[PDB]
Structure 1
């Protein structure tokens, strides 16, 4: 995993292009995908 850089991801079948950064917010244990607003995947859990 290469953070702070633009990359195409295929996390659990979700294909997309974009840069990822580091956040300090805390998710619940039962959440994997994340659509904060506007029908787009703000967050996703890395399976590894």
Structure 2
């Protein structure tokens, strides 16, 4: 049960195969729910399933 910058939620986190842009935080779906985040205090990028 994660909480990233106040956005709670549930899922399994894993390392990203994606290439992330250095101003963004959140990758968002057609379903309009978070799919990919960046750590609020680390530079690693995590895919949310």
TM surpasses 0.5? yes
TM-score, normalized by length of structure 2? 0.70
Offset at residue 38 of structure 1 (A): 1.2
Task: Provide structure 2 residue ranges, at least 5 long, that are not aligned to the other structure.
Answer: 42-49
Larger RCO (CA under 8 A, 6+ residues apart): 2
d(CA) in 1 for partners of 2:16, 2:25? 15
Task: Provide structure 1 residue ranges, at least 5 long, that are not aligned to the other structure.
Answer: 1-7
d(CA) in 2 for partners of 1:23, 1:45? 10
TM-score, normalized by length of structure 1? 0.71
> For the aligned residues, what is the CA RMSD?
1.1
Moved over 2 A (4+): none
Q: Which has the higher strand share?
A: 2
